[PDB]
Design an enzyme around this catalytic site. Structure first.
Site, mmCIF file in Angstrom:
data_model
loop_
_atom_site.group_PDB
_atom_site.id
_atom_site.type_symbol
_atom_site.label_atom_id
_atom_site.label_comp_id
_atom_site.label_asym_id
_atom_site.label_seq_id
_atom_site.Cartn_x
_atom_site.Cartn_y
_atom_site.Cartn_z
ATOM 1 N N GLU A 101 80.735 -4.266 19.983
ATOM 2 C CA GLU A 101 80.321 -3.443 21.113
ATOM 3 C C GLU A 101 80.717 -4.030 22.465
ATOM 4 O O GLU A 101 81.012 -3.239 23.378
ATOM 5 C CB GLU A 101 78.809 -3.187 21.041
ATOM 6 N N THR A 130 74.362 -1.740 16.590
ATOM 7 C CA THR A 130 74.828 -1.465 15.240
ATOM 8 C C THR A 130 76.201 -2.053 14.948
ATOM 9 O O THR A 130 76.727 -1.840 13.850
ATOM 10 C CB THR A 130 74.861 0.049 14.989
ATOM 11 N N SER A 144 77.345 6.280 24.821
ATOM 12 C CA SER A 144 77.089 4.854 24.709
ATOM 13 C C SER A 144 78.353 4.066 25.033
ATOM 14 O O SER A 144 79.472 4.576 24.946
ATOM 15 C CB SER A 144 76.593 4.494 23.304
ATOM 16 N N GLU A 170 76.846 14.870 46.673
ATOM 17 C CA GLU A 170 75.890 14.118 47.478
ATOM 18 C C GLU A 170 75.500 12.804 46.810
ATOM 19 O O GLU A 170 75.166 11.837 47.505
ATOM 20 C CB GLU A 170 74.655 14.977 47.753
#
Ligand SMILES: Nc1nc2c(ncn2[C@@H]2O[C@H](COP(=O)(O)OP(=O)(O)OP(=O)(O)O)[C@@H](O)[C@H]2O)c(=O)[nH]1
Ligand SMILES: Nc1ncnc2c1ncn2[C@@H]1O[C@H](COP(=O)(O)OP(=O)(O)CP(=O)(O)O)[C@@H](O)[C@H]1O
Ligand SMILES: Nc1nc2c(ncn2[C@@H]2O[C@H](COP(=O)(O)OP(=O)(O)O)[C@@H](O)[C@H]2O)c(=O)[nH]1
Ligand SMILES: [Ca+2]
Ligand SMILES: [Ca+2]
Ligand SMILES: [Ca+2]
Ligand SMILES: [Mg+2]
Ligand SMILES: [Mg+2]
Ligand SMILES: [Mg+2]
Lengths: 438, 54, 345, 423
Positions: A183, A179, A140, A254
């Protein structure tokens, strides 16, 4: 055959990883105890599925994966879960106290004390590979471990595996399931220190997954289990070429060649269709044209944004199920005459198509209905920069007041790293605008 | 619209369709940053203990 | 209780809309930087569309269509008409135009000269006009050398100057028709029933730009007959329709209004796939100002489309109320003056 | 295994601490004898956060009882759930503190603090991963206020990398014992500003008003006031005691709630507060949870702005409707939430409701309106200090007038710091 190692960092990375390997086993017919009846080469073999699974003399197919978390509660789920027999204990690494949603805590304070252990465990899996392509890292943006420790690990991986490719599956923060308030900080900090170490990163905005679950699956309040089930389907569609016989995206190199002409602009937009609720007993199966047309609907994208107001640099169509090339071309021709699809001048206006005849696998008892054909579009659009703008704006609001900055400085991080990371994001936004805007 | 590089196998096939032609830090430096940050923590904690000692 | 923010203090149209919303007692205005808004009266330049529709539990509506600048820019409009098959280069209601980049900077210099020489040789009227979006700076000349040299002195466009305009009597003067069009979140096209003619107070002379530019600012600054015929050089549809019946024995609806509605639909339907917010995480509406030219043959020509237009003083109250009714209240209902131009979505 | 060490000091601290353990013991199915008699595994999921497990499947609260007088702790031992506490965790003297901060902090308290730290050390040594400490105490007395802040200072010196959390009861002339309470509270506040990460401000003025104005208690007692605090403490610690994703530990809570180190004083709120069998809908919980009448700090939230907010809903209810109502509050009163902290309101839900209620909501707010509480204490402090009234009780214990001047300035600085962020 060349091996790929999967690395899952933090709660989001671990839980998403658990759902992916569950789906992999169902797709390859691998039982929870590691046995694979269809595999006739016992204890060895260089098949396509061997890029993700190793084989023991007893016939167990062990995933080439490492799970890392600075707190043991999440990984202990895998140690006692249904597929506990797949992984040996050396693959599950857990600390005691987590990063407390603090990038600095995950990167400097706690990360510095476990980094050598993680690398040593990764070295064990690398020694089992005849030819290692690279790594797939799940994490995350908003978590302290997912953001802070991942960036530290990516730096060390570039040092110890300089020639190996590294791809990310990153969870972009959304308030409806977030939460922590910081963030946005952790997202920019980790993106700044990881940008030069990642060759291709697939961002998944929890907001988009959350709304797709509520809209297409009729889930009133989607949980992480609902979200991860859907995310694992998109991840499976992206990695399917590495695990099955094929000729498109057959190795990690690739992915960069087909999706990333400019190194810094290595965030392709993923769009998936169809997402059908399992409660609907009988649903009109969508055609190739219909599911292909849905790949250009913002409501089906992993990141909400408007590609009509950007430019494309590359585009891949990954089909699974009953799909023949003739139907794909017919749908593409129709879409060109009704959609706004602008490519950059220095790139051809075309699509790389991959078709796997096996239709998508669904977890028994899950929320996704079985469909006869599905598609995942990977397009490198400048419109995805809208997610950077949103994130950078929230960063600017808080940092102007220095809100919460003392938590990071208290872990040994310098305040200058905040502005340094922000200036790098400002340059990243500038590059997108130069490429997609006239 | 041109189809190129058509590859077919038992499990599927792939191809390309064109609609229009075109018009790292070393281990030494990493450890210095980690130790530098850890040293700033020690300095900050030492000052707190000094404050508590007063 | 709905919420909205104001980010364009210079918008006279939405200043009234904001005033009306507050008068309803059901709309609360917020700081211009508060994200928890239902409606945004955004700014003209660099409106952060990317930050819209990301607020859980908030239906967000904005008063501008992202990507509509293609229609509201001189050079953009020309490129859109030529390159769009729905409009084609053979468009009959749009004057022959060419995009000319200044020499100090694709470009259509050689293409413009090719058609210019054909008119000079063919004895036809070869008077053109040069203009750009960076103007209040317009040059009208019959020699291509002066037009190109003026641009070099900002991207400009050159289109054919309508040498045979419909002249109002008494006065023998020029004019232009301004139409206001509202496009809601469903992409319904509403044409305001009330239009205005910005007429020139000076007699038209085909041999001084006062009698050629019908701008309200130029007529009130460089014209000596401002307000002689009509108040503020603004003739409304009621008077203009009566004149057409008395002079030409026809109505405004038949001779002109049919072509105006046809042009509005063609332009807006052409860009619909590129700006429509039907399946988007936020919704858009926008008020447009179409400016038309009428020739002596009663043919309507499209001149320009303004994405941030103003309104006539006498029509502010009615139009702004209609904006709140069909554009705002339709998405946020509380506790016709438009003509709907039906089309195929 | 993230353990918390609980400390309760002084009369108020021990009487409220005892009620807290009585409440949460019932929620986890622990009886007064320490035996578990619950019916759900969610009760034991995170039981080790507050309880140790002894021989015979006994659960012993990880609590240390401190006081300079034996009286109150004798009642706790001889009261409901008194036998559940570890006998060796009762640390008490005989002299008392005479409602005197200097006695608790410098003289009488200093004589006893080392024996308290010995018990704290013994409890921390047997912790797999110590989160930190939570202290219950009042600021208006001598032991909880004076010796409580001394303990915090010494705990921080020995455990500098641990979270320090307190439930601090603020004095009020409405519910007062001595005139020197503003002195003791002002001296304690500066200690808390520096040495705690999270402080729940419980104002005895608010508790009395709620008992009288809302609960219709004509003559509220301390026992009645402690009922509110017990229920509030149980709500604010819900996220610590049951499986959850948001604010599940002390450090993550601090990271979400404290944007600036000194501004860590929270306003708690509880709902419902009924004088009783009627069901309370999710919209009703949300409105009451944000209503000032349900706050515990006696501060009008509309007089300031919310820096951060932590909401906890308990019981079986529609989480969808919970999210809708929470978003409605923020969107209908967005002017009261600072815009430079995006998405500063976090909501958590717990299936297990508190005793006697099908649904409840707990409010934790970091509002700049809390400055009103410190202004009130500052005015009462200055009214006496300008005349040096009652200072001899403190100069007799070795303190100097300079230390009072510094405490006065420190709290006025704290008020000023709240004022800059309110604009
Ligand atoms: N899609 C999805 N997102 C998740 C999941 N778990 C957490 N997240 C998101 O990840 C962000 C928080 O990061 P975490 O992974 O939980 O934190 P962490 O990596 O364990 O680091 P710590 O702070 O030490 O706990 C939030 O935005 C969550 O919404 C998950 O299982 N699936
Ligand atoms: N091709 C043309 N033929 C005849 N007259 C023309 C013309 N192009 C422009 N004009 C005249 O010049 C005037 C101003 O041109 P234009 O409308 O491009 O200016 P502008 O955009 O600054 C004013 P607005 O925004 O109100 O339309 C028109 O109102 C019309 O009278
Ligand atoms: N809420 C509550 N407050 C109390 C209680 N007992 C005392 N107080 C308050 O605490 C202050 C006195 O402190 P106290 O705890 O008795 O002094 P200490 O024993 O020396 O710490 C006064 O402001 C009282 O109002 C109680 O049981 N409940
Ligand atoms: Ca094999
Ligand atoms: Ca590299
Ligand atoms: Ca003594
Ligand atoms: Mg974690
Ligand atoms: Mg204009
Ligand atoms: Mg007392």
């Amino acid at each position: 055959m060349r091996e790929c190692i999967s690395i899952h960092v933090g709660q989001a990375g671990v839980q998403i990883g658990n759902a992916c390997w569950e789906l992999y086993c169902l797709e390859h017919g691998i039982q929870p105890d590691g046995q694979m009846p269809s595999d006739k080469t016992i204890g060895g073999g260089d098949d396509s599925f061997n890029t993700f699974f190793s084989e023991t003399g007893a016939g167990k197919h062990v995933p080439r994966a490492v799970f890392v978390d600075l707190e043991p509660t999440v990984i202990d789920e895998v140690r006692t879960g249904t597929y506990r027999q797949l992984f040996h204990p050396e693959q599950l690494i857990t600390g005691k106290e987590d990063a407390a949603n603090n990038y600095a805590r995950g990167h400097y304070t706690i990360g510095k004390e476990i980094i050598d252990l993680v690398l040593d465990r990764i070295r064990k899996l690398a020694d089992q590979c005849t030819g290692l392509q690279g790594f797939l890292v799940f994490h995350s943006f908003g978590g302290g471990t997912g953001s802070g420790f991942t960036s530290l690990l990516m730096e060390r991986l570039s040092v110890d595996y300089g020639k190996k490719s590294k791809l990310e599956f990153s969870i972009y923060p959304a308030p409806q399931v977030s939460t922590a308030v910081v963030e946005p900080y952790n997202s920019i900090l980790t993106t700044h220190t990881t940008l030069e170490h990642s060759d291709c990163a697939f961002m998944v905005d929890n907001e988009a997954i959350y709304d797709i679950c509520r809209r297409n699956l009729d889930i009133e309040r989607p949980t992480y289990t609902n979200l991860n089930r859907l995310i694992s389907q998109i991840v499976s569609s992206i990695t399917a070429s590495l695990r099955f016989d094929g000729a498109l995206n057959v190795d990690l190199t690739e992915f960069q060649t087909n999706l990333v002409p400019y190194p810094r602009i290595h965030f392709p937009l993923a769009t998936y269709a169809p997402v059908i609720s399992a409660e609907k007993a009988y649903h009109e199966q969508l055609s190739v044209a219909e599911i292909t047309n849905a790949c250009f609907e913002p409501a089906n994208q992993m990141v909400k944004c408007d590609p009509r107001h950007g430019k494309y640099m590359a585009c891949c169509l990954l089909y699974r199920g009953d799909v023949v090339p003739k139907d794909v071309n017919a749908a593409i021709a129709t879409i060109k005459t009704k959609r706004s699809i602008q490519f950059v001048d220095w790139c051809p206006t075309g699509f790389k198509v991959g078709i796997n005849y096996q239709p998508p696998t669904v977890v028994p008892g899950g929320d996704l209905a079985k469909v006869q054909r599905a598609v995942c579009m990977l397009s490198n659009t400048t419109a995805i920069a809208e997610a950077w703008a949103r994130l950078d704006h929230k960063f600017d609001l808080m940092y102007a007041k220095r809100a919460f900055v003392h938590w990071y400085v208290g872990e040994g991080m310098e305040e200058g790293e905040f502005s340094e990371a922000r200036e790098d994001m400002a340059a990243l936004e500038k590059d997108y605008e130069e490429v997609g805007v006239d | 619209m041109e189809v190129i590089e058509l590859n077919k196998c038992t499990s599927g096939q792939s191809f390309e369709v064109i609609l229009k032609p075109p018009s790292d830090p070393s281990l030494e430096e990493i450890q210095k940053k980690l130790e530098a940050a850890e040293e700033r923590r020690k300095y900050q904690e030492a000052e707190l203990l000094k404050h508590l000692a007063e | 209780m709905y919420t909205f923010v104001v980010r364009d203090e210079n918008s006279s149209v939405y200043a009234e809309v904001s005033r009306l919303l507050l008068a309803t007692g059901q709309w609360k205005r917020l700081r211009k930087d508060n994200p928890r808004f239902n409606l945004m009266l955004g700014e003209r330049n660099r409106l952060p569309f990317g930050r819209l529709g990301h607020e859980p539990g908030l239906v967000q509506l904005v008063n501008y269509y992202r990507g509509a600048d293609k229609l509201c820019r001189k050079a953009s409009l020309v490129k859109l008409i030529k390159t769009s098959p729905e409009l084609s280069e053979s468009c009959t209601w749009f004057p022959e135009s060419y995009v000319i980049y200044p020499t100090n900077l694709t470009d259509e210099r050689e293409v413009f000269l090719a058609a210019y020489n054909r008119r000079r040789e063919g004895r036809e009227g070869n008077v053109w006009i040069a203009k750009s979006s960076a103007g209040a700076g317009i040059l009208i000349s019959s020699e291509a050398s002066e037009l190109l040299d003026f641009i070099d002195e900002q991207v400009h466009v050159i289109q054919k100057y309508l040498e045979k305009p419909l002249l109002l009597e008494p006065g023998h003067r020029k004019f232009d028709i301004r139409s206001w069009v509202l496009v809601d979140h469903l992409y319904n096209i509403y044409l305001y029933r009330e239009g205005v003619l910005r007429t020139s107070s000076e007699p038209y002379n085909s041999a001084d730009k006062t009698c050629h530019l019908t701008n309200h600012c130029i007529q009130k600054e460089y014209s000596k007959n401002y307000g002689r015929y009509e108040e503020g050089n603004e003739m409304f549809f009621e008077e203009f329709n009566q004149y057409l019946m008395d002079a030409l024995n026809t109505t405004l609806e038949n001779s002109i209004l049919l072509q105006i509605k046809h042009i509005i639909r063609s332009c807006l339907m052409c860009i619909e796939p590129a700006i429509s917010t039907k399946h988007l995480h936020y919704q858009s509406f926008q008020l447009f100002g179409f400016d038309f030219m009428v020739d002596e043959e009663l043919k309507v020509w499209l001149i320009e489309v303004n994405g941030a237009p103003a309104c006539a003083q006498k029509l502010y109250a009615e139009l702004c109320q209609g904006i709140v009714d069909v554009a705002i209240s339709s998405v946020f209902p509380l506790a016709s003056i438009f003509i709907k131009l039906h089309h195929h979505h | 295994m993230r353990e918390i060490v609980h400390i309760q000091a002084g009369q108020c601290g021990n009487q409220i601490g005892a009620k807290f353990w009585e409440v949460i013991s019932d929620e986890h199915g622990i009886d007064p004898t320490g035996s578990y008699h619950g019916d759900s595994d969610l009760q034991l999921e995170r039981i080790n956060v507050y309880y140790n497990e002894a021989t015979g499947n006994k659960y012993v609260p990880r609590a240390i009882l401190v006081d300079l007088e034996p009286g109150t702790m004798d009642s706790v031992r001889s009261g409901p759930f008194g036998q559940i506490f570890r006998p060796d965790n009762f640390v008490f003297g005989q002299s008392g503190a005479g409602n005197n901060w200097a006695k608790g902090h410098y003289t009488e308290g200093a004589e006893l603090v080392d024996s308290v730290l010995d018990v704290v050390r013994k409890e921390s040594e047997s912790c797999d991963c110590l989160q930190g400490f939570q202290l219950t105490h009042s600021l208006g007395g001598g032991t909880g206020s004076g010796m409580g802040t001394l303990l915090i200072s010494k705990i921080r010196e020995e455990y500098p990398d641990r979270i320090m959390n307190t439930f601090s009861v603020m004095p009020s002339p409405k519910v007062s014992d001595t005139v020197v309470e503003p002195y003791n509270a002002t001296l304690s506040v500066h200690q808390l500003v520096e040495n705690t990460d999270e402080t729940y401000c419980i104002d005895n003025e608010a508790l009395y008003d709620i008992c009288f104005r809302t609960l219709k208690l004509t003559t509220p007692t301390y026992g009645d006031l402690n009922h509110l605090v017990s229920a509030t403490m149980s709500g604010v610690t819900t996220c610590l005691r049951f499986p959850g994703q948001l604010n599940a530990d002390l450090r993550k809570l601090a990271v979400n709630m404290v944007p600036f180190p000194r501004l860590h004083f929270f306003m708690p709120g509880f709902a419902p507060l009924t004088s009783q069998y009627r069901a309370l809908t999710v919209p009703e919980l949300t409105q009451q949870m944000f209503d000032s009448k349900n706050m515990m700090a006696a501060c009008d939230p509309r007089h300031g702005r919310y820096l951060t907010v932590a909401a906890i809903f308990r019981g079986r209810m529609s989480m969808k409707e919970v999210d809708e109502q929470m978003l409605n509050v923020q969107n209908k009163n967005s002017s009261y939430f600072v815009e430079w902290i995006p998405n500063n309101v976090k909501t958590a839900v717990c299936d297990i409701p508190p005793r006697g209620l099908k649904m409840s909501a707990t409010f934790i707010g970091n509002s700049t309106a809390i400055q009103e509480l410190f202004k009130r204490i500052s005015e009462q402090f200055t009214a006496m200090f300008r005349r040096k009234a009652f200072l001899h009780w403190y100069t007799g214990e070795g303190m100097d007038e300079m230390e009072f001047t510094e405490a006065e300035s420190n709290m006025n600085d704290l008020v000023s710091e709240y004022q800059q962020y309110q604009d």
